[PDB]
Amino acid sequence: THDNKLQVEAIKRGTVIDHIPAQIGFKLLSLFKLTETDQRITIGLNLPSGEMGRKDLIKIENTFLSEDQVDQLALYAPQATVNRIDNYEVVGKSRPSLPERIDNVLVCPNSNCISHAEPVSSSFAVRKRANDIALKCKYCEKEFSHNVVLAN
Amino acid sequence: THDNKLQVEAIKRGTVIDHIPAQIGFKLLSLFKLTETDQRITIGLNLPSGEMGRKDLIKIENTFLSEDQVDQLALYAPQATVNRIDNYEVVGKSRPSLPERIDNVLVCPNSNCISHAEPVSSSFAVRKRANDIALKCKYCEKEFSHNVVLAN
Amino acid sequence: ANPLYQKHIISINDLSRDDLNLVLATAAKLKANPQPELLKHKVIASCFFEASTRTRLSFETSMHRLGASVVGFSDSANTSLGKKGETLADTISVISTYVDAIVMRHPQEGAARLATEFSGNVPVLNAGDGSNQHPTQTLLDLFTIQETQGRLDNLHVAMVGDLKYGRTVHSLTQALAKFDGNRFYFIAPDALAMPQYILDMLDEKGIAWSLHSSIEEVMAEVDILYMTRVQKERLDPSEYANVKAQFVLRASDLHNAKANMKVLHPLPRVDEIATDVDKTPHAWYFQQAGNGIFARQALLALVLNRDLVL
Amino acid sequence: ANPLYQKHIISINDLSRDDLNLVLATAAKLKANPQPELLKHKVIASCFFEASTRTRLSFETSMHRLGASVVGFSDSANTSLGKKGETLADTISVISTYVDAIVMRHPQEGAARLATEFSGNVPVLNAGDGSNQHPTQTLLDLFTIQETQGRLDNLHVAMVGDLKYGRTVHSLTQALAKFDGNRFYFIAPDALAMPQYILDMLDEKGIAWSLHSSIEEVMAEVDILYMTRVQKERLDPSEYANVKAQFVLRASDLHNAKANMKVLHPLPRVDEIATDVDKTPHAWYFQQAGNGIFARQALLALVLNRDLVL
Amino acid sequence: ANPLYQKHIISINDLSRDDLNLVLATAAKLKANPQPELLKHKVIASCFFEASTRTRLSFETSMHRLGASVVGFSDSANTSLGKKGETLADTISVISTYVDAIVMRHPQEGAARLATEFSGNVPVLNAGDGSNQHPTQTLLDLFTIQETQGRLDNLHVAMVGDLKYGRTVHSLTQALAKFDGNRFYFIAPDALAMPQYILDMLDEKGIAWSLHSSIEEVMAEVDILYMTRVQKERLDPSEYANVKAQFVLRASDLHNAKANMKVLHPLPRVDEIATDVDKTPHAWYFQQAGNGIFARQALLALVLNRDLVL
Amino acid sequence: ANPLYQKHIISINDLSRDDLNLVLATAAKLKANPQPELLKHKVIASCFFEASTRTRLSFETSMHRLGASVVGFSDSANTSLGKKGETLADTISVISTYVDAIVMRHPQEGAARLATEFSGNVPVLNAGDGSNQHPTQTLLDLFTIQETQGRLDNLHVAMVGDLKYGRTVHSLTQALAKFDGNRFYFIAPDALAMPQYILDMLDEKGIAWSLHSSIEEVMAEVDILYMTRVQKERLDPSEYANVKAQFVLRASDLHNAKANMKVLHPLPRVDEIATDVDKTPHAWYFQQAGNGIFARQALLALVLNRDLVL
């Protein structure tokens, strides 16, 4: 990120989710179970920035993401920027592109979906609307505003 | 001492939970809702050591813990120590001894216990039976082995 | 004797404003200075042809707070009294030979009024008849509003939820439509919107009402926020989920809530009011359930006691 | 006021020995010299979320023996109060606005303690919460033992039956573990043996206990023989048949029974105590049920009456 | 290698126009020339987790019309296998090891879809999942619409009743909205209007539709008058009392009906279609039901057969 | 003239080693080469006096796999024929005059055995009688054990769960205790231990067995890990709360499992086997279920056929 004095270092063969909103950081570690490994991961919840001020920052080392795994980040930091990196150099830096689907992480607001009690990882069809994202469940086939799906 | 190899650089007065066993650092962030805050929060897991080898380690920049908070961690992070550091100088090393009352982060393994559906927080009476810590449900008054309550 | 003496409380429409005030007043007298033997020796019938634990418990406690005796029944698998499918009338016709007053709850609209044409000289108080009335509930709601606002006129009253079906809602609205200056805000899903028959009645009496899809739209201006329970069956699950937010309160939604705003709810609340709302000073649903005791006491006192002292 | 005044009786573990003796003492006072208007004007809630006719009848009779009023419910198909699946808390939260004390029975362990964190200032007495406690039962058992033995110390107490699951058993044992010199004899099938958690507690307090597979093994030395009901479902039928004998009393098994031995049983007895045991002088299960009236009276008196005269 | 061979049958949304046709073509072939031993040796599970006589018997009958065997069950007094608890996944992983294809009905949306994730190579046909789909009798409605109109394009379709909740109209409409020329008429009170996600999809496809209040204002140009039931138990009694006589069809309302006009109803009809309409030539509901045998047959013959000699 | 021809199938105790083999041999022949018209023209009663979906459908499916017809019933909301009262004897003397063989399940031990005393010449196959026998799925467990291990001798068998009450483990154990070399591992809390009448019979036959507390201390030498369910509704909640995580299997506990090791479970599993084990190669429970079709088939083909062309 921008600013470096008494901060963290850098890596060699790992990704760096930079520019992630405040509070949404930890959640991204939860929703996607990233800490669930042995790779040296480092976080920066509430960091110094230029435009957005305090952005959380995760740098899981020796771990790579696809153009899609990055797009799973899409709903929780459209601004963010995944940083593939090697030899201390940003080999490539991708951005959250809206996905065509979202599996495992989202829960079906349809209390009557067979999805719940059952041993199946959820799944929705994605489609941007004028002001939001429409998510359609693979099971009950009911569509919901992402504002309601992600809604607790 | 270790962080002065690939300089993540330690910081001044405050509390830095360190010597947590890897894979048990996301937990405390989660369980004790530690990332719910704003003070310069930095996190590093799967690090190096010796007899442990690895370790998680949260750093809560300037802001202290209770003597007991030092304890609630005792069930999860035994061999570890919160640093009552007063500006770079690691002065005040608090080592969490087993707490006698756990509240909120534990779940009563009794599927019939009143606690589950209702708006109350769990709470158990700690004791080290055979030394394997036997926790008593404030509610059902049933006693289980800490290794039964923790599982799920 | 007093205006309501030996009268019948079937509808919130057969009651005037003097009437209501008369009930609240008495309900305040009794709260401050209780008369535990006012109905000593009277026997009351708590007939709940339809099950309602919270109302039955309340009414019966109001019955024992004046020293009156009690007998009754509940949701019998096969209609109570007669014991075979005999008519409601033959039922009331008998119990009225035993008691001094009848409190009843029936699943059919107009049940209290029909009993009325049979209780002989016996006063019958309606505790609920199908989706029609439920006067005692409105009384305690008005008693709870008037106590905490000091009045029942020029009030900013917002009503949220199943405005379409809630009988207490239609009723409170009609009662408040007896006082002046009241302003209503109605927040509910158009599939559960406030019936026209009511907006039409408010239109006539010249009262101001407006529709809102969100609580925060008027939270700013409300004195009393009266929430309803959107009986989960009233909707298709996925439908429910998508409208759920429209009608649920939390503590954070309270930030710009007036100092005097009390949050009422006829109960049960469980899917509408987050438990964190509980510890806020606005929450008043339990204090509200508490006032059903003084409202029901007041009602019984007046009706069974001739020259009610105060 | 008295030590137990406005206190809560949730567990037989939250009670001390002064406490207990205090309850028995009062229970003896009232038995000899009754005060029928001691709770005149108080209203008590007999809430039996779980059905228990014999305890409800008893408690309510103790409630009317002091002149107190009563309201309540029983095993409602769909949880009582709230009337839709609202939380136990929202239930207690309301009833507590109506009553002066709450007696409740719930099928979930810890139900009385949770209500306690909601009854406001209202005393709640636990009549039974799942397989956890049931204090009033132990009180009448201790009151029945202390009355007929003249004491509660150095007693030869034999317990027979479903020692593994019976909550009254675990509880009486813990209470008697508050007095000195007690010696326990436990007769039950190892599949239904007395939990270690208890033998471990008796081990600590230094109390003598021994295991026996037959009643006649100690009939010789027992003062009180406390039988349990081996809920017939706890076992596979053929299993039950083969262990049945281990735990059943008859008059002939009494031959070498001490003069002072009373045969107690929390009831129902029906598959454990032959009816011929009835007419023997040892039989005391009915006198025992009789003392639940004075125990429950004592409990209510203390708790709802400040300066309890005696 | 047949298009629908070994393919699951879950949502109308998954069946392309040509799919619909292969089914309706194959259908008529089977009704012209029955292949009774076609599925001889094949065992099929008729699992109705949500009892539904009419559909099940129509389905099972179809199965026997092609020579197959049937094992199955109805209602789920229980939990849906697992002696209570067991996931729908396990009860399908199992069953799928016995039969050659599963026909299922379930009270929860998604059910069949999950199913197909556990039956491995066994085709799963949905006979109704909660309020989601019912591919089955819609492939038969369609079959009926084409058998009598000769086509599924350039048709005038009116739909009456519970359009908001009728899961069969939503499907039929989505189904016909795959062919061209069709014009829709929606006659339902404001309370049960055809949802907007159906109307959007229509406008988005250049398909004409319009709302009407009386059958009479469209009876002259209607080819198919498709009546849905009124989920009565779902409304208020007085409300449905109203919204009835308006959307009830009588033989006299048929005076100006087109010569080729047919009346359809997924069944059962009790209030909606008067009995004096049965005898008029437009009455086609029972003939439509009978057609469920041929649609259900084609579907099975197609899914379980590589190439059909037809 | 086939050994099992026209012979009843009631207890594992009645089937000799060669009997087991003829069934398991004939089984595999039928799974290799199905004889679909083998029992054509034969009618079979599928009488489940104690509903049991999974077993019944597996059984009935088997019947249809050999060409037979089925009439029958499930659950006994009633009394077991007699419009209430009628003895099981009369309802069998009758049925036996219609069908060619009776398949029965009953809640009482002895049921099938009595049955055979009244069906005259009609073979009675027991599909489970109370807590006594279930010959049927044990002939399929065995079939599964041999299909995957290639043998029923010199095996290492571990058994987990409710061993005291699992009527299927008792049978399996008695069944395997007829072949030689087998070694048993019993992993169950002290509360549900494998009874001693099973262990005696073992010691009395020079068959090795041993008790263990963790699957891990035997996972390396286990050929068949046979999991039984935990009759949860049978225990105390807190007790089963404990005795769980200890006897629950997870895919990770499989790290050192032998290459040929298989996991079995009579089904249903909900707590006992984690869902992440299904995907590992040892998971064989659903394949074992599917094998019930072949064991059940052989049994019918053998009992109803003099000499089988196989």
Ligand SMILES: Nc1ccn([C@@H]2O[C@H](COP(=O)(O)OP(=O)(O)OP(=O)(O)O)[C@@H](O)[C@H]2O)c(=O)n1
């Ligand atoms: N060895 C490295 C290399 C890169 N990064 C991170 O990768 C991102 C690269 O962004 P940077 O080159 O520092 O430019 P900025 O000014 O931060 O703006 P931008 O985020 O748009 O790149 C930053 O989060 C930087 O900290 C890192 O932590 N360690």
Ligand SMILES: Nc1ccn([C@@H]2O[C@H](COP(=O)(O)OP(=O)(O)OP(=O)(O)O)[C@@H](O)[C@H]2O)c(=O)n1
């Ligand atoms: N301002 C500071 C000071 C210390 N630390 C952390 O405190 C830990 C322990 O420091 P200390 O006990 O003073 O010396 P160590 O050599 O680390 O002790 P040990 O050998 O037990 O790890 C170190 O890992 C260091 O990173 C920190 O994060 N910030």
Ligand SMILES: O=C(CP(=O)(O)O)Nc1cc(NC(=O)CP(=O)(O)O)cc(C(=O)O)c1
């Ligand atoms: O209001 C009461 C008891 P009370 O007079 O508040 O002590 N009971 C009552 C009211 C109401 N009032 C409503 O407005 C319906 P809601 O509770 O969903 O808001 C409904 C029911 C019911 O069981 O359907 C029961």
Ligand SMILES: O=C(CP(=O)(O)O)Nc1cc(NC(=O)CP(=O)(O)O)cc(C(=O)O)c1
């Ligand atoms: O003891 C009472 C009534 P009480 O306090 O003696 O007037 N009821 C009670 C106690 C107990 N006490 C037991 O110890 C069980 P048991 O009656 O089988 O010995 C059980 C039940 C039950 O319904 O399961 C009910």
Ligand SMILES: O=C(CP(=O)(O)O)Nc1cc(NC(=O)CP(=O)(O)O)cc(C(=O)O)c1
């Ligand atoms: O057609 C039937 C006869 P059934 O009563 O299910 O045996 N049922 C059915 C069909 C449908 N809808 C259809 O379109 C099938 P149809 O064309 O047979 O009417 C819906 C339902 C429902 O429960 O919502 C039920």
Ligand SMILES: O=C(CP(=O)(O)O)Nc1cc(NC(=O)CP(=O)(O)O)cc(C(=O)O)c1
């Ligand atoms: O196998 C089944 C399937 P089902 O639920 O009876 O349809 N049931 C069954 C088997 C068995 N035991 C067996 O060994 C048969 P299996 O090998 O199929 O598990 C016991 C019981 C019981 O009720 O105790 C029930």
Ligand SMILES: [Zn+2]
């Ligand atoms: Zn869904």
Ligand SMILES: [Zn+2]
């Ligand atoms: Zn508990």
